[PDB]
């Protein structure tokens, strides 16, 4: 294949594995940063049936009441659509700090993610939500009016337009008073010169963008003029509201397995075969990059057969992963032993800074020490016919050193003291 049209998450891994700029939006180029040309910006939205309800629900808690009144369903197989509920309560794929993604920190195991997933499985068990439904069945149900609401992107709108049923698009409802944070995908083209020029001066045009959008709605197009002439449509406005409420998808190569992991967790979470915490732990273990297949399988089995120590298992797996990657509390605690004299305190803190991974040991034995706990060097020069040499002793003053040196001379068969070099010289 020459060019691939897809969301911007996988092009980063593809690149890892091997005036025109001003014509598009800057964040679109920044997201694909260059490896791909942005074409469309897509975000999920809540599409409801106008005849079913006058106004959409604002909170996720009210949706079960409306559904049981009907007696909500969408694509459950793909994590993409279910992710906003998880991300609403603090769930994040990777820690985005000072503009950089921290692969070492993964927030899928957060408590808010647990609350979102347990609310989803509560919807599943109450028969309000279908665990085995997919995108096609959800589209068919919304086209036939079986479901009052659905979660879908711009592309399905034309298909809904084929069903001629009145549909209203809006922002996804808030979860526990917190708005959702859907992933914002950038549908862009990645090249495996003629194809590049055909993308540039033919596809990236108002006529080309409008021709593509007529077949299937691209949502937010990267081209400025078509965005300006298409911003009048309120559906695009709702899509951008969802986008700013959401977070852009990362470009790091660590997403694909991540997606796989999340998918498995959702498949574990929806079917009821495993609890929310165990599914999240399995997803976290699958996310971990440097674990060997045998090690990952062993950790998976250990999490499966005993969920009591899941936190300790995750900590040990993270430690092993950091060890195979190609203390501050201890620092504060060590300084606070009162009876410990200064010398061993520096020794222990030097060991702590020297080897962090032994800190849990180094702290503990220090406590085992704590309960247990609770001078000038002068030189003699003998210039004698019977004894020639020099020796040293540590003393608090020249007087104690003088007695010590005189005793040493007494056991060994004119005394002068040079204070500048702290030297007693004895001449026989």
């Amino acid at each position, epitope marked *: 294949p020459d060019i691939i049209f897809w969301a911007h998450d996988r092009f980063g891994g593809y690149a890892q594995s091997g005036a025109f700029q001003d014509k598009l939006y800057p964040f679109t180029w920044d997201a694909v940063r260059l490896i791909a040309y942005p074409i469309a910006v897509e975000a999920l939205s809540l599409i409801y049936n106008k005849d079913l309800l006058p106004n959409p629900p604002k909170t996720w808690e009210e949706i079960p009441a409306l559904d049981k009144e009907l007696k909500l369903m969408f694509n459950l197989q793909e994590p993409y659509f279910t992710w906003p509920l998880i991300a609403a309560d603090g769930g994040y794929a990777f820690k985005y700090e000072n503009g950089k993604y921290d692969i070492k920190d993964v927030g899928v195991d957060n408590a808010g993610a647990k609350a979102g997933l347990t609310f989803l499985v509560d919807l599943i068990k109450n028969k309000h939500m279908n665990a085995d439904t997919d995108y096609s069945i959800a589209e068919a149900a919304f086209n036939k009016g079986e479901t009052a609401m659905t979660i879908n992107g711009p592309w399905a709108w034309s298909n809904i337009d084929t069903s001629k049923v009145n549909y209203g698009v809006t922002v996804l409802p808030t979860f526990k008073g917190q708005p959702s944070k859907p992933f914002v995908g950038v549908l862009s083209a990645g090249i495996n010169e003629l194809a590049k020029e055909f993308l540039e001066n033919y596809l990236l045009t108002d006529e080309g963008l409008e021709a593509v959008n007529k077949d299937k709605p691209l949502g937010a197009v990267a081209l400025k003029s078509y965005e300006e002439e298409l911003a009048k449509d309120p559906r695009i406005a709702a899509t951008m509201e969802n986008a700013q409420k959401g977070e852009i998808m990362p470009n790091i190569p660590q997403m694909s397995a991540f997606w796989y992991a999340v998918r498995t967790a959702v498949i574990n979470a929806a079917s009821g075969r495993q609890t929310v915490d165990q599914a999240l732990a399995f997803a976290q273990i699958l996310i971990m990059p440097n674990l060997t297949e045998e090690q990952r399988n062993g950790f998976i089995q250990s999490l499966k057969d005993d969920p009591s120590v899941s936190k300790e298992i995750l900590a040990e797996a993270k430690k092993l992963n950091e060890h195979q990657a190609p203390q501050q509390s201890a620092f504060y605690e060590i300084l606070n032993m009162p009876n410990l004299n200064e010398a061993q305190r520096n*020794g222990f803190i030097q060991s702590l800074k020297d080897d962090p991974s*032994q800190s849990t040991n180094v702290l503990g034995e220090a406590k085992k020490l704590n309960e247990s706990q609770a001078v000038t060097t002068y030189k003699l020069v003998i210039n004698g016919k019977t004894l020639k040499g020099e020796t040293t002793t540590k003393a608090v003053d020249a007087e104690t050193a003088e007695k010590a040196f005189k005793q040493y001379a007494n056991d060994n068969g004119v005394w002068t003291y040079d204070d500048a070099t702290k030297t007693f010289t004895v001449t026989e």
Partner: antibody, heavy 123, light 113 residues
């Protein structure tokens, strides 16, 4: 010729701390793992500590676990062993030894040993 | 760890004939993939650092005289000196380096005359 020379030994009171240094010459110090091994007249040879080439893997003896710390400075070609909370049973002579490359493929054990520094602990 | 026990605490002998020093392991130290027994024999002259004599319990280290030979398997390993020389008085340690690192109790070799 490979030369390993240790320093820092002496007499220290029980419960104190002591740092031993070992300087290596004649080989790429930044590529070979290092061992600290102590010997006493009444107990004999035993292995105390081991540090890998890139300091990513470190192992300690059973009786010195949590008390001793091993490290190395590759740019300075030095190997450091810090002992804290010393006890009277630690009076021994310490050597720094080299671990040959890929002993799981060729089987060469600890080959080059230093002279050794004598550490004695007493009141 | 795997500690080793050397049978002779000390042995005296005249120069010219053979001596055998044996040592026992608590468990097999044979690496499965290599099919090589991970054990070494070290010699330590008085007032000197230990010197490597034999590795893999059969292979002879570079520069080691042909008199020194290693044999044995399972849990029993023997070091044999075919012709003991006067400057061969030292302490011999058998040492495993498969799991952790441990050294034998030490066998002292004396010279009779």
């Amino acid at each position: 010729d490979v030369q390993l020379v240790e320093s820092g030994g002496g007499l220290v009171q029980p419960g104190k701390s002591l740092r031993l240094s070992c300087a290596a010459s004649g080989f790429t110090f930044s590529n070979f793992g290092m061992h600290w091994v102590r010997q006493a007249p009444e107990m004999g040879l035993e292995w105390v500590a081991y540090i890998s080439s890139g300091s990513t893997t470190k192992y300690y003896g059973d009786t010195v676990k949590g008390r001793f710390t091993i490290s190395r400075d590759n740019p300075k070609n030095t190997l450091y062993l810090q002992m804290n909370s010393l006890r009277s049973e630690d009076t021994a002579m310490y050597y720094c030894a080299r671990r040959p490359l890929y002993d799981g493929d060729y089987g060469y054990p600890m080959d080059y040993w230093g002279q050794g520094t004598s550490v004695t602990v007493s009141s | 760890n795997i500690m080793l026990t050397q049978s002779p605490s000390s042995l005296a002998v005249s120069a010219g004939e053979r001596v055998t020093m044996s040592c026992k392991s608590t468990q097999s130290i044979l690496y499965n993939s290599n099919q090589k027994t991970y054990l070494a024999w070290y010699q330590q002259k008085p007032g000197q650092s230990p010197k490597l004599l034999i590795y893999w319990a059969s292979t002879r280290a570079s520069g080691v005289p042909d008199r020194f030979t290693g044999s044995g398997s399972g849990t029993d390993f023997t070091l044999t000196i075919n012709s003991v020389q006067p400057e061969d008085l030292a302490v011999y340690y058998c040492h495993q380096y498969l799991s952790a690192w441990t050294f034998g109790g030490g066998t002292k070799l004396e010279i009779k005359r």
